Every structure is written in structure tokens, then in C-alpha cells.
């Protein structure tokens, strides 16, 4: 017989994260290769493993594998990448890294997929998936019309999909944020708690994924909260036994009170429940989301006390567990008309009861989807991904969806850039793009899901590219090491006004003082110290009128330290008139 096909079907079928891993060690030990070695590994595992039970997954890799956005793993073989987290959209990046030809290096701060919660999945998540032979890694992926997978089974898909393709992984290691190089020649480096290995703590990257969840994002990253009504949030677990009786209960999509006001009602004057939303998936539990107001939680003594600060109103302290797993099996009972038996919990990674409360209130998004830093000469590509890009509402079921288009996105973003585009250019792209995440739909996407790959034209419809401009992100673009000599010329021609200092195309110009030195030198005299607006516009219509020199900055704009780029534009003039005098 032939090992390699046990330690092959083992690590296919291993339901626990660290036995996908030891299971992938084993089939590669049988198989002459070490894990984390690019699409070459990938290339021997299948050279190998050619029967029966691989050959259809094989296919769909390879189907995928050779979409001319990849080209055939040349497009970023010259790319170093680190994703930060093993969370669905960060595997789901390392796959699109993976195949696009790059080195990609992956740290989870956890050793083990925990989260039992269900994810609605939309129609192309659902066909990608697929595609990346998700039955063939479950099963029970998707039967008949499901709509939805539990987290960590789909942590499960994307791992095995993404280790196969030689991803480099690392488990139980916290990514705290950078390391600048030391000096020209080097590049980007991670500080990592808490022993992070000799050679992951030495590797030099020149990509950063960021999939870090909800509230984790790197620096210079700034995001932008706001807030709606308090909503409050449970959702809970309870053991499926997939009997008859079971299966034959409908699952609720979404009941919403703004329309089903008799059921709510009936809901509250039989239980004291008071609910605005309940969702039930039938899925490896029973699965439950529901939303509540705060006074309700209150009066059911669920909360202990009205405290004004969401993230201490919902703290271990203040949540009763007793109260809040009879609230949940209360109502989930009532919304299934008790057809689904006397109901059990499930327990979570830990071992309590599977009931967990979060705050619905907030609508977060960050302001960029990406920034480029740059020291020594090294070039840093930070782009973010998932539950840390854009805050996904978990009723209406984004999260998948929004967040696996943020890693094409992304993934399309780190193509360009290993094609060697401006900096600017890459972000405008991915600004461009970033625009349309938060308002994203199936209906306002392309109807032909089967044929969705990175390439944004085949996802977004009546596509600009050009929504945003090289100009306006010089914001994300970030340095802190031909352009030489305007600044020298600048500085001896502004020499000697009082409160007059050339250091650079932004600040030193923001108060009008610093144009004015120019022009009045260039030209003396039409002659003191004004104002600010006043000496700014001041220097653009004397200038305009006198020199010759049209504004390409507004006067706000210069005054802002905005366009450095467009007083670049406009100084470079003086500089073509007056250099050779
Ligand atoms: C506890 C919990 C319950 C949820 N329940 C629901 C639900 O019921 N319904 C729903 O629609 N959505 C739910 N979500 C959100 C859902 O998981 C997301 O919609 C989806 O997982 C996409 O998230 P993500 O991949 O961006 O990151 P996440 O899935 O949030 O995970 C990010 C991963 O990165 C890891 N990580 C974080 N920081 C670091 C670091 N510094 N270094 C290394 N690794 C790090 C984390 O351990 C995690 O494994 C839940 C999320 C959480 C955390």
C-alpha cells in the first residue's frame, strides 16, 4: 500500500486545528517535503499524492491556480508578505498571496479554531469556496440550500487550502507591530511576542496583511467609530443531535419586529422577553442571534447595573451567565414553537455554556484600506483585511462576503505593486476600490458569481479605478528618510525674511510668509508681515499676475500643507523661469 494516502486522508479529515497540523507534518514527512516551502511543495504534494481521492481537488486548485492573474505564480514571486491572524479572512489572503507567487509567512496569536458562531455565507463565497474543494475538505459543507458554516469549520477549509499551498504558519504568536531597518540595505520586521523563532523574528518582509479582527490595527492606521442606536447583542449554541424531529424545524433568516410585531409581542407577554431581531441557522449546533435593548436586559436581570460605558455594561462583571442562558434558551425555545426538543447548550472552547453577549451599537470603518511606509529605502505595503477593515453587522450577514472582497482587493493591490506601480498609485487604486466596500450587496455586484477572481472588474460593476487620485492619498503614504534641488533653490531664494523657514513642500509653506519671500525676492519691489490667507493669496495672484505662473494649489491647499506634489508643480516653475538668472 501506499502510506502518504492515510497521512493524506487523515490530515483532509482532521477536525481539530493542531490535528490538521501534526496530520500535515506526518503526510509531509511521508512525502519529502517540509511544510511552509512556497508552490513548489505544493507542486510535489500533488506530484505524489495523483489518485483517486486527490484528483478532483488537485483539478479545482489548479483550475484556480492558472487564472491569468497569477500567472502561473510569477506575478509576486518577488514578494515577501506576512498576514497577521488565521482568522477565515486572513487564510483566505494567504491562499490569494499563495497562488499569486509570493512568500507568504502567517502568525496566529491562538492554537486552536474556538469559535462555534455561525457565518451566513453569500452566493459567491459560497461557489468560491467551493471551488477550493470545500465539500471535499467537509462534507456537510453547504447541504441542499444552507446558507451559512460555523467559524472554525471554515477556519479548517482555508487552513488545510492554504497550508497545502506552502504557506508558512506560525501558532500561539502575537504580532505587536513593526520594526523599522536598522540601516539602507535591510527591510520590515515584526516584534513578536512571546518567543517568536530565531528566523520568523529575523524575516524581512516588504508586504503586511493586517486580518486581526475587529479591534486589532496597526499603527499609523487610524479608524473612524460611529455609533448607533445601543443595541446589545446575544448569540448562543445549543447541541444539534441532527434527529428527525430536529431537522424538520424551518430556520429564520431574519424575523424582524419592524414587520412580525404580533410574534414579538406574543414573545414578551408569555416570556418578559423583549427582542428587536432573532435568527436561528440550523448548522453543527443549533445556532441563535438575537438583539435586545438595554432596558429589557436589565429588568430580566441579565445586567447588573445601568453602567453608561458599553464595554463595561457587557463585562464579566456585570453579565449574570445564569440569566442570560435562561434569556437565550427562552426566547430560542419560543421562536422555534419548542420544535426543536428540551434544549441543551453546547459548550463554548472552554466549557460554559454557549452564550455570549456583544455590543451591536457600533458601525466602525477605518479610514484607509492600506498606507505605505518607507525608511532606509525599504517600501512597506500595509494593507488591512476583515473584521479590522470594515465592522460587519451580523444579522444581515456581511462578514464573509465584505471581508473575503477586502483580501482580493488586497491581493490584487500587492499584484500591482510587485508590477512595480508608484506607491501612490497602488493606494489610489485600493482607495478607489475601499470606496465601494461599505455599501457592497449581491445586487449592486455582478450576477455571474461562478466567474469572480481578483481582478476587481469581474466583481464590481461600472468600475472606476480612478475614484481617487495618486494626489489626494499622499496621506497614506509615509516617509521618513530630483526633488533636491527645488528644495535648495527654495531655501537661497527665501533667504532673509524674518519669520521665513524652507524645509519642505507642506509646512513650511502653510502661513503665507513663505511664497511671499520668493515672489518679493524674485521680483522686488511691490513690498510687510499680513496675515495668512492674506500673504497666501497675496503671493498666488501676484505671481500669476506679475511672473506669469498660474496656481496649481488652491490657497487653502497650500495653506493646509495639503498637495506637497502640487506646490511641487507650482514652485517647479519659478524654479524653470528664474533658475539660470
Ligand atoms: C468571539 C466572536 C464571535 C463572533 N460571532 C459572530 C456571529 O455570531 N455572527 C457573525 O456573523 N459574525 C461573528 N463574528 C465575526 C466573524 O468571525 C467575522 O465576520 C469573520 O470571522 C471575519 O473576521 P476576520 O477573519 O477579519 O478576523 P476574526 O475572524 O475576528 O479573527 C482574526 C484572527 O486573528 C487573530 N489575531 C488577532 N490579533 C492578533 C495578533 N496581534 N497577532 C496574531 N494573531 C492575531 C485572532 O485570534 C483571530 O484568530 C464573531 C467574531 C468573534 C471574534
Known sequence: TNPAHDHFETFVQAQLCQDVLSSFQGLCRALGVESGGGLSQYHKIKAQLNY????????????RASQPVYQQGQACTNTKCLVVGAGPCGLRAAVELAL?????????????????????LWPFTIHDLRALGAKKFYGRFCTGTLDHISIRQLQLLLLKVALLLGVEIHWGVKFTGLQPPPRKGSGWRAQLQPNPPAQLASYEFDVLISAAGGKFVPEGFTIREMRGKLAIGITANFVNGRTVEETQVPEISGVARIYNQKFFQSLLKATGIDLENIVYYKDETHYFV???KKQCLLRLGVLRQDLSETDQLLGKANVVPEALQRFARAAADFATHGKLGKLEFAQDARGRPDVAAFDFTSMMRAESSARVQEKHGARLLLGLVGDCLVEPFWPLGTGVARGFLAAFDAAWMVKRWAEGAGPLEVLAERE???????????????????QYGLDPATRYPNLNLRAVTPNQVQDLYDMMDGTEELLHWCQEQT????????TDFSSSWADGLALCALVHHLQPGLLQGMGALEATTWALRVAEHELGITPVLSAQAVMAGSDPLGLIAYLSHFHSAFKNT
Request: avoid cysteine; glycine fraction near 4%.
Open 495 to 502: 533667504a532673509g525674511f524674518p519669520g521665513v523657514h524652507v
Open 100 to 120: 499569486l507567487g509570493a512568500r507568504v509567512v502567517l502568525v496566529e496569536k491562538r492554537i486552536k479554531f474556538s469559535r462555534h458562531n455561525v457565518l451566513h
Open 52 to 63: 483517486w481521492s486527490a484528483k478532483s481537488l488537485w483539478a479545482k486548485l489548479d483550475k
Open 432 to 450: 478607489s476600490l475601499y470606496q465601494l466596500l461599505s455599501q457592497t450587496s449581491p445586487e449592486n455586484m455582478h450576477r455571474n458569481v461562478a
Open 290 to 292: 438575537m438583539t435586545a
